[PDB]
Design an enzyme around this catalytic site. Structure first.
Site, short mmCIF file in Angstrom:
data_model
loop_
_atom_site.label_atom_id
_atom_site.label_comp_id
_atom_site.label_asym_id
_atom_site.label_seq_id
_atom_site.Cartn_x
_atom_site.Cartn_y
_atom_site.Cartn_z
N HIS A 21 0.86 -1.18 0.00
CA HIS A 21 0.00 0.00 0.00
C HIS A 21 0.90 1.23 0.00
O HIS A 21 2.10 1.11 0.26
CB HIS A 21 -0.87 0.03 1.28
N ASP B 244 -1.36 8.79 -1.38
CA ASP B 244 -1.33 9.96 -2.25
C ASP B 244 -2.17 11.03 -1.57
O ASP B 244 -3.39 10.89 -1.41
CB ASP B 244 -1.92 9.60 -3.62
N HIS C 126 -3.68 14.50 -1.92
CA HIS C 126 -3.99 15.50 -2.93
C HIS C 126 -3.52 16.89 -2.51
O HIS C 126 -3.36 17.78 -3.36
CB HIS C 126 -5.49 15.53 -3.24
N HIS D 252 -5.54 9.04 -0.59
CA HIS D 252 -5.94 7.66 -0.87
C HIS D 252 -4.75 6.81 -1.29
O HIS D 252 -3.68 7.33 -1.65
CB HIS D 252 -7.02 7.62 -1.96
N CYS D 253 -4.92 5.50 -1.19
CA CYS D 253 -3.87 4.57 -1.58
C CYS D 253 -3.87 4.51 -3.12
O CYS D 253 -4.92 4.68 -3.76
CB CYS D 253 -4.20 3.20 -1.01
N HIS E 221 -7.97 -0.50 -4.72
CA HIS E 221 -7.65 -0.13 -3.33
C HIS E 221 -8.56 0.99 -2.88
O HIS E 221 -9.10 0.94 -1.77
CB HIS E 221 -6.17 0.29 -3.18
N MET F 190 -9.89 2.41 0.90
CA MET F 190 -8.62 3.02 1.25
C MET F 190 -8.44 4.46 0.85
O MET F 190 -7.59 4.78 0.01
CB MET F 190 -7.46 2.14 0.79
N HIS G 14 -26.74 17.35 0.28
CA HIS G 14 -27.91 18.15 0.59
C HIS G 14 -28.37 17.86 2.02
O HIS G 14 -28.55 16.72 2.40
CB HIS G 14 -29.06 17.78 -0.37
N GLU H 132 -28.67 24.83 -1.86
CA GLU H 132 -29.67 23.84 -1.54
C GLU H 132 -28.99 22.49 -1.66
O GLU H 132 -29.02 21.68 -0.74
CB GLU H 132 -30.90 23.93 -2.47
N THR H 133 -28.29 22.31 -2.77
CA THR H 133 -27.57 21.07 -3.06
C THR H 133 -26.27 21.49 -3.78
O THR H 133 -26.31 22.29 -4.73
CB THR H 133 -28.42 20.15 -3.98
N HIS I 127 -27.84 13.83 -2.94
CA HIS I 127 -29.13 14.06 -3.60
C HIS I 127 -29.57 13.35 -4.88
O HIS I 127 -30.43 13.84 -5.62
CB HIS I 127 -29.50 15.53 -3.61
O1 LIG Z 1 -4.35 11.61 -7.75
N1 LIG Z 1 -5.00 10.58 -8.51
O2 LIG Z 1 -5.65 9.44 -7.94
O1 LIG Z 2 -34.32 17.30 0.39
N1 LIG Z 2 -33.85 15.97 0.15
O2 LIG Z 2 -34.69 14.92 -0.34
CU LIG Z 3 -3.75 0.10 -0.52
CU LIG Z 4 -34.75 17.16 -1.80
CU LIG Z 5 -6.17 10.91 -6.38
#
Ligand SMILES: O=N[O-]
Ligand SMILES: O=N[O-]
Ligand SMILES: [Cu+2]
Ligand SMILES: [Cu+2]
Ligand SMILES: [Cu+2]
Ligand SMILES: O=N[O-]
Ligand SMILES: [Cu+2]
Ligand SMILES: [Cu+2]
Ligand SMILES: [Cu+2]
Lengths: 336, 336, 336
Positions: free
Chosen positions: C92, C95, C97, C132-133, C142, C147, C252, C276-277, C303
């Protein structure tokens, strides 16, 4: 404004290049508006998209998938001479999302094999825009057969950030992402056909599932890796233009970021900054500006890792330069 | 704020109209806050959603898919009288994404067939908002059966661009986009059911595939095309409100742009500009403002073109006026 | 810059806590830059993801899905000791970001079972970021095995709105959303495997459908409900950090809103307001700030209602306090 005024404008012939490269151009417009001319011949051709020999009956502008990036400045006129050789079997046309009127030009450019047409439009809005074929009743089929690309309409004064500071790039790359729907026989093996129309029926069926069999950059799995990996050097400022004419994407530079991202692809809409992963809806193009700080290989991907690593949406960058230990360092290398 | 203040507010009843049309209203608020009254009767009825006669047991507010657009101004109170006729077979309620408390109002409005209820809420935030039915335990089912709409809460001072300059529209249309999941038999033929409940199990299986069989505007394929196409004229400013209560969409005006787009649908968030294609996530409404510059037919679509042209997400705009050759011109019409 | 200047920096070891909780931290930076130390042990373990007992051979950072949230300030150095136990079967890596170089740290942290490593990077950009892995050749497997997690790099001055006005939250929760791809037998029942290896092939097939069988919060359907529901009070300012390392999500809060939402998760990008969303693309983390105004139960969902109520992406908030009749009131309770 008037036909006379446009007729008096200087004209410039531009030589197009195959993606990911972009034809020569100036970031800051050199002169007043001009009528920039481009020419593209449509080629219906078989392309091999993976190491399994899977074929797609491509419909390519200028012979590539995606078609070439055309660069003009705001308020210039883009004049394209589109040609459909008698060697083709289908009627084709072109819709520029950057243009205003007649379905982006598609209603004025329907050419059967053996025809040509010349369309002129004023690039009134600055930003990166998708362009693609759209023959009435066969629209998605042509688009998912690779018949799409993008253009970039730079502001006259070049790119600037949200606070007005200039953003000048050193390199520019155009990544066209494509979603392909290749039919499989009853055994799960991709089918091969002797002609576009032969694949039509089978291909529409796959399309309706909305699940692509392949999602690739520059027409094929691995197109932009190895001999075709993009390059840069630590300290270099690179602009990556990315387009997807039919389906959403979420670009991500593994090991880097999007320092400034015009996610909507429109230069008058302020860019997002320090982006890890951005989003470009199907039907649009976006642009990311980044200054490389670390040498080594990077992977530029559509961040739905299944699409990136199983479906084909992955590209590489090979960067030269000195390693920066302040930014990152292995305090203890993998050990017992 | 206080009891006397709320009680003293003027009450105003508003007659709704079926989408894409919007009831009479003023952009800039007329007078102070009021309690705006609306009434909607719920209808469970079979509707044909395509050209092949495919039926669906719809559940609709005011009998339409989508439900009508309710327009109020910020800080007004929206008081809705929701009626569920004894002829219906299911319990229904309503969740206003514009509202604060009790699951958007769903917790206070659960009415069995034969019941009505009156919900009031202060419209505290400006923007376009989705509203939808949400009976506990079967939320998705009621929403994807057509039970959703949107409301617009205008700023008391009307719309404005990023720098305080007023944006006044001449017309406004409401396009509600619906993802349907219609079961098919072993033969691939869509199935018909006696009562809504009979389709429940088969429908959920299709829903879980996350692949709709239809993606339509105004309840049916072609609902907003031909004689039912929306209209405009060169120089006219149009506001298009678009919603999707369950799934993402990427609106695009083919041949045009979204000059100003509140892609999140919220007016306190500056709109993006010069948009080619925007993105509205499932569970939200968005709004695009555009001044037409060219006459002719336009296609307003969900830019996943397979969804637009294979699944049904495409509408038309018929625009009158004079062609502008500066904007676009055919230098050489399609010819040998 | 120099290893000497970073070594002279104060160091502070942190004890991580399991999601949705976040370890102790200060919003405004406690003095100058420091090297913040974290340790995580990787555990490959079977987990139950639903009430029917469906199991998944998970790959979890700190034994949790998602992995815990690490919190540091801009310009601090995050130093992670990552351990891969002898009991594990796979190699493993990690990474970040948020990091710059070597594929986010992934190329400097490849550890086989029985190995460990220590990576340090400068948290140069403020925002919430996914980690993440990413074992070369087995990246999506993974990640969709659980992961992944997120980190938050707070501005040294705490959070602020788009206009510089300070934004201080009373509580914070980290919601990690996971898409699982579980194989099913000929009877449609989920399959169970002895070793995670036996599941690979079948899982990849499901992954290629781009259709998850489960989409859950904190590793399981209903994990953040009942007595595990998140809590708040009327008047309380809550920040919710949400991440999805592989697939898009559209958060949401049913009955509420996202008062200020850094939908892209980056603090230098002004937040959208009155949402809202909102939308978080796969491969990213986002953050939303909200001040509760009404007591009662809230459902925090992805949502796409099918993903929320059929697939598992729904959490609850239990809010204490007094009901605000001004904001919302049942004028007439469900009656005849
Ligand atoms: O950063 N790419 O999985
Ligand atoms: O407002 N969400 O169903
Ligand atoms: Cu992994
Ligand atoms: Cu809704
Ligand atoms: Cu990534
Ligand atoms: O812009 N229409 O495909
Ligand atoms: Cu074509
Ligand atoms: Cu288009
Ligand atoms: Cu209902």
């Amino acid at each position: 404004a008037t036909a006379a005024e446009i007729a008096a404008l200087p004209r410039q012939k531009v030589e197009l290049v195959d993606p990911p490269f972009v034809h020569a151009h100036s970031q800051v417009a050199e002169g007043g508006p001009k009528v920039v001319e481009f020419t593209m011949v449509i080629e219906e051709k078989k392309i091999v998209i993976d190491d399994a020999g899977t074929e797609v009956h491509a419909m390519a502008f200028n012979g590539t998938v995606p078609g070439p990036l055309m660069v003009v400045h705001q308020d210039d006129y883009l004049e394209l001479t589109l040609i459909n050789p008698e060697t083709n079997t289908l009627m084709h046309n072109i819709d520029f999302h950057a243009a205003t009127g007649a379905l982006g030009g598609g209603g004025l450019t329907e050419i059967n094999p053996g025809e040509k047409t010349i369309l002129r439009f004023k690039a009134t809005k600055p930003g990166v825009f998708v362009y693609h074929c759209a023959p009435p009743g066969m629209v998605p089929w042509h688009v998912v057969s690779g018949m799409n690309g993008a253009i970039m309409v730079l502001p006259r004064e070049g790119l600037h950030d949200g606070k007005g500071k200039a953003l000048t790039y050193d390199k520019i790359y155009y990544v066209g992402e494509q979603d392909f729907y290749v039919p499989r026989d009853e055994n799960g093996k991709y089918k091969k056909y002797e002609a576009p129309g032969d694949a039509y029926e089978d291909t529409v069926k796959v399309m309706r599932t909305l699940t692509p069999t392949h999602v690739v950059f520059n027409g094929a799995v691995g197109a932009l890796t190895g001999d075709k990996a993009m390059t840069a050097a630590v300290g270099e400022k690179v602009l990556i233009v990315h387009s997807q004419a039919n389906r959403d994407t979420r670009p991500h530079l593994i090991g880097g970021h999007g320092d400034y991202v015009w996610a909507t692809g429109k230069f008058n809409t302020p860019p997002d900054v320090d982006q890890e992963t951005w989003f470009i809806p199907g039907g649009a193009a976006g642009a990311a500006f980044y200054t490389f700080q670390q040498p080594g290989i990077y992977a530029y991907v559509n961040h739905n890792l299944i699409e990136a690593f199983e479906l084909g949406a992955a590209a590489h960058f090979k960067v030269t330069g000195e390693w920066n230990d302040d930014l990152m360092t292995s305090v203890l290398a993998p050990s017992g």
